[PDB]
Design an enzyme around this catalytic site. Structure first.
Site, PDB file in Angstrom:
ATOM      1  N   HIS D 201       0.770  -1.240   0.000  1.00 23.84           N
ATOM      2  CA  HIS D 201       0.000   0.000   0.000  1.00 23.84           C
ATOM      3  C   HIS D 201       0.791   1.275   0.000  1.00 23.84           C
ATOM      4  O   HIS D 201       0.343   2.360  -0.385  1.00 23.84           O
ATOM      5  CB  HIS D 201      -1.130  -0.107   1.030  1.00 23.84           C
ATOM      6  N   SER D 205       0.723  -0.903  -7.001  1.00 27.49           N
ATOM      7  CA  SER D 205       0.728  -1.852  -8.061  1.00 27.49           C
ATOM      8  C   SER D 205       1.455  -1.494  -9.338  1.00 27.49           C
ATOM      9  O   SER D 205       1.226  -0.561 -10.078  1.00 27.49           O
ATOM     10  CB  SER D 205      -0.665  -2.398  -8.234  1.00 27.49           C
ATOM     11  N   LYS D 227     -14.101  -5.761 -11.282  1.00 27.45           N
ATOM     12  CA  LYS D 227     -13.122  -6.707 -11.803  1.00 27.45           C
ATOM     13  C   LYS D 227     -12.921  -7.868 -10.849  1.00 27.45           C
ATOM     14  O   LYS D 227     -13.015  -9.013 -11.241  1.00 27.45           O
ATOM     15  CB  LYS D 227     -11.742  -6.145 -12.074  1.00 27.45           C
ATOM     16  N   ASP D 228     -12.659  -7.523  -9.601  1.00 28.56           N
ATOM     17  CA  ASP D 228     -12.460  -8.524  -8.566  1.00 28.56           C
ATOM     18  C   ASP D 228     -13.665  -9.434  -8.395  1.00 28.56           C
ATOM     19  O   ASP D 228     -13.532 -10.662  -8.341  1.00 28.56           O
ATOM     20  CB  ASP D 228     -12.110  -7.897  -7.223  1.00 28.56           C
ATOM     21  N   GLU D 271       1.477 -33.859  -3.791  1.00 25.21           N
ATOM     22  CA  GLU D 271       0.411 -33.382  -4.667  1.00 25.21           C
ATOM     23  C   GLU D 271       0.958 -32.420  -5.713  1.00 25.21           C
ATOM     24  O   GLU D 271       2.155 -32.156  -5.766  1.00 25.21           O
ATOM     25  CB  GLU D 271      -0.685 -32.697  -3.853  1.00 25.21           C
TER      26      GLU D 271
HETATM   27  C1  HEM Z   1      -0.940 -16.288   1.047  1.00 26.36           C
HETATM   28  C2  HEM Z   1      -0.678 -16.037  -0.227  1.00 26.36           C
HETATM   29  C3  HEM Z   1      -0.834 -14.666  -0.880  1.00 26.36           C
HETATM   30  C4  HEM Z   1      -1.877 -13.826  -0.959  1.00 26.36           C
HETATM   31  C5  HEM Z   1      -3.317 -14.041  -0.449  1.00 26.36           C
HETATM   32  C6  HEM Z   1      -1.454 -12.682  -1.719  1.00 26.36           C
HETATM   33  C7  HEM Z   1      -2.165 -11.605  -2.103  1.00 26.36           C
HETATM   34  C8  HEM Z   1      -1.876 -10.541  -2.827  1.00 26.36           C
HETATM   35  C9  HEM Z   1      -2.764  -9.611  -3.507  1.00 26.36           C
HETATM   36  C10 HEM Z   1      -4.279  -9.707  -3.307  1.00 26.36           C
HETATM   37  C11 HEM Z   1      -2.014  -8.751  -4.201  1.00 26.36           C
HETATM   38  C12 HEM Z   1      -2.402  -7.581  -5.124  1.00 26.36           C
HETATM   39  C13 HEM Z   1      -2.599  -7.943  -6.603  1.00 26.36           C
HETATM   40  C14 HEM Z   1      -1.523  -8.498  -7.470  1.00 26.36           C
HETATM   41  O1  HEM Z   1      -0.484  -7.878  -7.762  1.00 26.36           O
HETATM   42  O2  HEM Z   1      -1.632  -9.658  -7.950  1.00 26.36           O
HETATM   43  C15 HEM Z   1      -0.623  -9.117  -4.033  1.00 26.36           C
HETATM   44  C16 HEM Z   1       0.469  -8.492  -4.604  1.00 26.36           C
HETATM   45  C17 HEM Z   1       1.788  -8.869  -4.443  1.00 26.36           C
HETATM   46  N1  HEM Z   1       2.192 -10.049  -3.864  1.00 26.36           N
HETATM   47 FE1  HEM Z   1       0.991 -11.431  -3.022  1.00 26.36          FE
HETATM   48  N2  HEM Z   1      -0.114 -12.809  -2.061  1.00 26.36           N
HETATM   49  C18 HEM Z   1       0.279 -14.030  -1.549  1.00 26.36           C
HETATM   50  C19 HEM Z   1       1.542 -14.544  -1.753  1.00 26.36           C
HETATM   51  C20 HEM Z   1       2.676 -13.907  -2.213  1.00 26.36           C
HETATM   52  C21 HEM Z   1       4.056 -14.469  -2.232  1.00 26.36           C
HETATM   53  C22 HEM Z   1       4.396 -15.880  -1.796  1.00 26.36           C
HETATM   54  C23 HEM Z   1       4.831 -13.411  -2.585  1.00 26.36           C
HETATM   55  C24 HEM Z   1       6.304 -13.373  -2.905  1.00 26.36           C
HETATM   56  C25 HEM Z   1       7.214 -14.064  -2.245  1.00 26.36           C
HETATM   57  C26 HEM Z   1       3.943 -12.309  -2.934  1.00 26.36           C
HETATM   58  C27 HEM Z   1       4.378 -11.085  -3.374  1.00 26.36           C
HETATM   59  C28 HEM Z   1       3.571 -10.100  -3.872  1.00 26.36           C
HETATM   60  C29 HEM Z   1       4.052  -8.908  -4.505  1.00 26.36           C
HETATM   61  C30 HEM Z   1       5.520  -8.527  -4.760  1.00 26.36           C
HETATM   62  C31 HEM Z   1       2.980  -8.168  -4.885  1.00 26.36           C
HETATM   63  C32 HEM Z   1       2.939  -6.801  -5.622  1.00 26.36           C
HETATM   64  C33 HEM Z   1       3.136  -6.748  -7.134  1.00 26.36           C
HETATM   65  C34 HEM Z   1       2.865  -5.525  -7.878  1.00 26.36           C
HETATM   66  O3  HEM Z   1       1.687  -5.236  -8.112  1.00 26.36           O
HETATM   67  O4  HEM Z   1       3.851  -4.834  -8.232  1.00 26.36           O
HETATM   68  N3  HEM Z   1       2.619 -12.601  -2.761  1.00 26.36           N
HETATM   69  N4  HEM Z   1      -0.573 -10.227  -3.206  1.00 26.36           N
END
Ligand code: HEM
Ligand code: HEC
Ligand code: HEM
Ligand code: HEM
Lengths: 62, 64, 43, 379, 81, 106, 241, 55, 32, 109, 54, 48
Positions: D201, D205, D227-228, D271
């Protein structure tokens, strides 16, 4: 002139969000029933006599 | 009764005939040189497949 | 990586080792109570 | 302000990260996986809590218990098959997430990247213990062989595998442990997610172009709430399509057999989510070498920030990485395949070159490609 | 802090938009999709498809061999001899 | 000793740009860079013209991305026109900071 | 490391997304299990709840469930005074306890059929092609009497007596009891038993499929309108001077 | 000044000893039980099986 | 200034009911 | 700011509600129940997770299970009794908390 | 609630599940509690604002 | 009892052996069980 079906619908039900919502509640109701009815029918047709509903006769009340 | 007829039919098709020749030589090769480690099982494993693909489709329309 | 390396930095490293060195000793003490080596107990 | 509901409550202001937030315009469909990611976390939980409303965590019963949830309990069948399938989705979604980060350089957000990584690994633990709860032949063995794979460590290992198990094997002691940690991980993980969101935040993005969008920003409420919701709609679709039409399809394991400790499915494997991990271990002769390399599979993620070589955080304008990005993905698919393969010559030799390809793609190829592209652009 | 009044600084740009109720939400979708879908797929295909193709070959070959070497129970070394 | 290879590379560079999205997009190559702390300062150093330009370009670009529409063939960024306008600015910013490190080091 | 033969995608009434289970098959199949199979294989999670699932009435299955408790009854479960009546009782365990079971079949342990179609990789195809697949051992092969040769067993050899043979049993209606014809009905009762939820799920899936499709179409349209303004908008840079 | 620092240090040591015991107790319960660990290392059987098989 | 420049045409985007310049927006608006 | 650990990470700033926050001077001992209340929740939690590491949830066993936790498991006895007794504390503490805002007008918030 | 006519297994597993997940939900409420309370600070014996002595 | 009751491990082993010889695992369901074992719990006065 008369209001398109939509315009009619609009002014009667969608100006006020109270009405709108009321609509949707109502609709959700009506819709669930028709859908099911129709969509169940459709599905039972595809399996005529395959389902117990079709097959209860055999062993029922003699 | 049902199963046993259809099986035969299936092995009456040109591709079943054709690949049963490997079974026939297999069986004889093996039975005559009985000491060999040659498996006749492996040879059978091709026949069976093609017999059964066929069986399935037809065999089904005959049961209850 | 390359930026971090410097001729000037050495005093900090020397100072760090003692604090770091002191810190290292604590873990051995901390680990040892949990570890309970008979040899450690013998010590 | 007066009677601006939002900032009146301080609490309700904190919720205006959904409605009022600056969201880039341009934005592939890929980003919906964040949101869906959360969706899945919430669905597993609601589902879990109901299943754990009729499940027991003992040797004797566990199999029975699940069996009873799927038979006598009303709508317990879908709940359970929704829970199983979900977790598939949850992972399918996760790996889209990380792909996107890999490709558009969202991972520049180091702090966000490091939370992600923790996220990923935490879920990974979760999934590994839940699958063992039902205590069926696949589960039983899978736990042994993974856990034991920890006994590779020279000094401790051995002692430590025995602590984790609560004994010499995997009897009741272990079985109730997994039940408890499975239960409590997801709650802990939600805290993490929110912490992850917190950091993100602070910089918003990234986009397909790879450039700041501050000059183009949009209402999250107006646009990105639909969208969501739409994303959901497709997400659910897939989850019910799976759960309703082919319940077992995606759940490779057919072992609905109560675990008999002398018995063994010669074909033991994790799995689909964990399929890649099993394959990585196989290519190395040595046990310990395989455990290190297994960890490095996953743990290699946090390097990529440092590996970045190009001036364009966006792969979008750099062909060559778009080609090696895809290949890694297809190498990853290739590895997943090996996972369900007899550990014999054919598969061995393949996996081994795939496991080198994966680490090359990530460690060495891409980084160079970056440079090249930068030099062709004269950057 | 505040995310909307504080993003960046933008001078001299006009934007023109229309209301939802005045326009259509599905703008010659078949016609745009075909040509746009076509035009990006064809710029993706080359960068994306290859590695998958590759996997398929490797899958195919890789399974053939297995079945052979194992079904060819006599493969390793012959029978007669 | 680069006459043929570099010549191929020069031809290759145009292809690379053509291969690269930015040329297709019509936005300048310099504009595409990962906005980090050095780029950031360079950015800030831009004249009103250069700098407002980079704002419209990205505006027009993120608009397109949002609509999945490509710009017309006639209006695309041609490789031969590589405004490396950030480069000048961006170099120094780095140059300054590399020094800073040298002074800090010794 | 022996090649394993694999099951055909045998023509089933239910192969298809909307296709559902054929209860008459179920019914038949049941008996097959009960007469042919109850002897050495158990079905623990199956109660005497065929009622609506199997079209057996409540009175029908009550009675069917009563005699099974009269002969095999709760005396094998531990209910000393137990006899006919009850419906919560689960299918009667061939033997007191597993160890026995292996003794009766000499080392082997008759797998609980409850989940076998689902349980064995390869589903009801495998189960049907196992029972119906029994061919002559291959030139140069040896077989211990128990080790009957079956063309579809992993290890290429199974401890299974004549699973099913023509005229093994007789069905009420008069369905021609062919080895195969009976197998087609036996599998089906297994598939229904193995995945009770799945039968209900297919019907639900059809309802789900239509609703999801309808919802998806509206959302794309609803989604388009909200995002239309950004897409519709064209911004033209204006020169400062 | 030294006295003040010493007083603070003394309090920490008392906490650590309790902490080690408390932490150890939590860790110990999880690692093993005398339920399981009763059966461990205790096994005998013989002469009840064929002069031929394997149990 | 703003007065000098004409807004870009939305006729393509604009709905058929609201498409005609002559046609009153208000009548079209209720329907739209 | 530069290298002010606290505000550097945004996350770490959030934690300066413990360290830097304005705290009234005068302040009865009663307030210590808020903090204590939270120690109790954490205690209960760790304890619970270790108990639920060796508990079963069935008619047959439950009793036994608890009984097994207190006999054969290593330091499960105190873990369980700590658990049970904890919750008493948790409540004793909660009712001090409510009394203090019933008395001092904290409920004004 | 009981998942039957009495309190048999049904009910006892439900309690186990809810007991385990309520304290984790509670923890978020406690932090939401602290959130609000950080907007106005803690009251005192005297009942008067202490902003003059912080 | 070993340490808890000062009965040795040999002492209680013995003490626990005879209780398994007379009341033994034949009341538990170990058909052929006799003297030896120590993980066995005190013998239930009645079957159930
Ligand atoms: C429990 C699992 C996870 C949930 C529920 C989650 C959820 C989210 C959501 C809802 C967003 C915003 C939309 C998007 O960019 O796709 C986001 C962005 C992001 N997530 Fe995750 N995420 C998870 C796992 C991870 C993992 C394992 C990593 C990296 C090690 C990660 C890194 C990031 C990053 C870097 C962004 C920002 C990207 C950008 O828009 O520039 N996420 N995450
Ligand atoms: C006479 C006793 C007996 C009967 C009757 C019987 N089985 Fe079996 N079955 C066995 C034994 C013993 C095995 C173990 C095979 C082995 O371990 O080689 C077995 C194995 C199986 C397998 C093999 C699965 C595997 O890969 O281990 C299947 C499938 C099976 N039974 C299903 C059935 C079905 C369906 C029926 C009724 C139509 C049936 N059986 C009737 C004794 C029996
Ligand atoms: C994303 C986090 C989680 C994932 C990946 C996950 C995954 C799984 C998987 C793969 C299984 C095995 C089911 C089978 O194949 O039979 C399982 C079972 C189970 N899980 Fe979950 N789960 C998660 C969260 C939870 C939660 C939060 C709960 C409790 C609130 C829970 C409770 C259970 C129970 C009781 C079982 C056992 C019965 C069964 O097999 O359904 N899980 N879990
Ligand atoms: C899980 C139980 C609870 C926890 C963990 C908790 C936590 C805390 C903490 C840490 C503080 C700050 C320090 C203090 O004032 O003592 C506090 C203050 C406060 N809590 Fe609690 N709380 C809990 C339950 C409650 C209850 C049951 C109430 C009343 C219904 C309540 C109302 C308050 C109020 C009104 C204050 C502010 C008083 C003031 O400082 O002027 N809390 N809480």
């Amino acid at each position: 002139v008369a209001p398109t079906l939509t315009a009619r619908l609009y002014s009667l039900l969608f100006r006020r969000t109270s009405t709108f919502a009321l609509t949707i509640v109502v609709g959700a109701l009506f819709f669930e029933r028709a859908f099911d009815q129709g969509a169940d029918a459709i599905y039972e047709h595809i399996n005529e006599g395959k389902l117990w509903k079709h097959i209860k006769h055999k062993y029922e009340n003699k | 009764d049902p199963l046993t007829t259809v099986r035969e039919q299936c092995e009456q098709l040109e591709k079943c005939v054709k690949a049963r020749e490997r079974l026939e030589l297999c069986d004889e090769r093996v039975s005559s040189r009985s000491q060999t480690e040659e498996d006749c099982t492996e040879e059978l494993l091709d026949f069976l497949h093609a017999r059964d693909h066929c069986v399935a489709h037809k065999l089904f329309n005959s049961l209850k | 990586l390359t930026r971090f390396l410097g001729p000037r930095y050495r005093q900090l490293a020397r100072n760090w080792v003692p604090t770091a060195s002191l810190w290292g000793a604590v873990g051995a003490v901390g680990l040892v109570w949990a570890t309970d080596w008979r040899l450690i107990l013998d010590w | 302000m007066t009677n601006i509901r939002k900032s009146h409550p301080l609490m309700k202001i904190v919720n205006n990260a959904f409605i009022d937030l600056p969201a880039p315009s341009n934005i592939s469909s890929w980003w919906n996986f964040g949101s869906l990611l959360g969706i899945c976390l919430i669905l597993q939980i609601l589902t879990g809590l109901f299943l754990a409303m009729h499940y027991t965590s003992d040797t004797t019963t566990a199999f029975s218990s699940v069996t009873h949830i799927c038979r006598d309990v009303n709508y317990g069948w879908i709940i359970r098959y929704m829970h199983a399938n979900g977790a598939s989705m949850f992972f399918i979604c996760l790996y889209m997430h990380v792909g996107r980060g890999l490709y558009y350089g969202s991972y520049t957000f180091l702090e966000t990247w490091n939370i992600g990584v923790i996220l990923l690994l935490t879920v990974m633990a979760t999934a590994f213990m839940g699958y063992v709860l039902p205590w069926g032949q696949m589960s039983f063995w899978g736990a042994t062989v993974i856990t034991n794979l920890l006994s590779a460590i020279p000094y401790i290992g051995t002692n430590l595998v025995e602590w984790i198990w609560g004994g010499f094997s995997v009897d009741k002691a272990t079985l109730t442990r997994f039940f408890a940690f499975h239960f409590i991980l997801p709650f802990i993980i939600m805290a993490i997610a929110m912490v992850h969101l917190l950091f993100l935040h602070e910089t918003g993005s990234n986009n397909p172009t790879g450039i700041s969008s501050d000059v183009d920003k949009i209402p999250f409420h107006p646009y990105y709430t639909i969208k969501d919701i739409l994303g959901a709609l497709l997400l659910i679709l897939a989850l019910m399509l799976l759960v309703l039409f082919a319940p077992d399809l995606l759940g490779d394991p057919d072992n609905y057999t109560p675990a008999n400790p002398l018995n063994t499915p010669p074909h033991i494997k994790p799995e689909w989510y964990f399929l890649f991990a099993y394959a990585i271990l196989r290519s190395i002769p040595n046990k310990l070498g395989g455990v290190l390399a297994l960890a490095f599979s996953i743990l290699i993620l946090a390097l990529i920030p440092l590996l970045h070589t190009s001036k364009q955080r966006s792969m979008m304008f750099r062909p060559l990485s778009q080609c090696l990005f895809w290949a890694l993905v297809a190498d990853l698919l290739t590895l997943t395949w090996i996972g369900g393969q007899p550990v014999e010559h054919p598969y061995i030799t393949i996996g081994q070159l795939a496991s080198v390809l994966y680490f090359l793609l990530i460690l060495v190829l891409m980084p160079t490609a970056g440079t090249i592209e930068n030099k062709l652009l004269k950057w | 802090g505040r995310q909307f009044g504080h993003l960046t600084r933008v001078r001299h740009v006009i934007t023109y938009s229309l209301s939802p109720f005045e326009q259509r939400a599905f703008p010659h979708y078949f016609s745009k999709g075909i040509p746009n879908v076509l035009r990006r797929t064809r710029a993706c295909i080359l960068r994306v498809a290859p590695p998958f193709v590759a996997f398929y070959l490797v899958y195919t070959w890789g399974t053939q061999e297995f079945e052979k070497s194992k079904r060819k129970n006599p493969a390793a070394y012959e029978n007669d001899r | 000793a680069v006459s043929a290879s570099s010549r191929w590379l020069e031809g290759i560079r145009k292809w690379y740009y053509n291969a690269a999205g930015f040329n297709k997009l019509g936005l300048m190559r310099d504009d595409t860079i990962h906005e980090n702390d050095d780029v950031k300062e360079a950015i800030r150093r831009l004249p009103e013209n250069l700098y407002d330009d980079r704002v419209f370009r990205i505006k027009r670009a993120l608009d397109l991305s949002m609509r999945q529409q490509i710009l017309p063939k006639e209006q695309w960024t041609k490789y031969e026109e590589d405004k490396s306008y950030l480069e000048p600015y961006l170099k120094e910013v780095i140059r300054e900071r590399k020094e800073r490190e040298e002074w800090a080091k010794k | 490391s022996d090649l394993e033969l694999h099951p055909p995608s045998y023509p089933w009434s239910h192969r298809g997304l909307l296709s559902s289970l054929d209860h008459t098959s179920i019914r038949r199949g049941f008996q097959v299990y009960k007469q042919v199979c109850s002897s050495c294989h158990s079905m623990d999670y199956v109660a005497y709840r065929h009622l609506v699932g199997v079209c057996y009435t409540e009175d029908e299955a009550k009675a069917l469930a009563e005699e099974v408790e009269v002969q095999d009854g709760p005396n094998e479960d531990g209910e000393m005074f137990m006899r006919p009546g009850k419906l919560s009782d689960y299918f009667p365990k061939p033997y007191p306890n597993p160890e026995a079971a292996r003794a009766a079949n000499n080392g082997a342990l008759p797998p609980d059929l409850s989940y076998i179609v689902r349980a064995r990789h390869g589903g009801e195809d495998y189960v049907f092609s196992l029972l119906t697949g029994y061919c002559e051992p291959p030139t140069g092969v040896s077989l211990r009497e128990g080790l009957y040769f079956n063309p579809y067993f992993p290890g290429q050899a199974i401890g299974m007596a004549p699973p099913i043979y023509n005229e093994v049993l007789e069905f009420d209606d008069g369905t021609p009891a062919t080895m195969s014809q009976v197998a087609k009905d036996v599998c089906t009762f297994l598939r229904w038993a193995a995945e009770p939820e799945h039968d209900h799920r297919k019907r639900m899936g059809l309802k789900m499929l239509l609703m999801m499709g309808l919802l998806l179409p509206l959302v794309y349209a609803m989604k388009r309108h909200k995002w239309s303004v950004l897409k519709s908008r064209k911004l033209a840079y204006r020169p400062p001077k | 000044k030294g006295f003040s620092y010493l007083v603070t240090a003394t309090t920490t040591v008392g906490v650590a000893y309790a902490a080690k015991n408390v932490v150890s107790q939590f860790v110990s319960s999880m690692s093993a039980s005398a339920d399981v660990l009763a059966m461990s290392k205790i096994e005998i059987k013989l002469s009840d099986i064929p002069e031929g098989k394997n149990m | 200034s703003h007065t000098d420049i004409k807004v870009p045409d939305f006729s393509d985007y604009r709905r058929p009911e609201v498409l005609d310049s002559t046609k009153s927006s208000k009548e079209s608006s209720e329907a739209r």
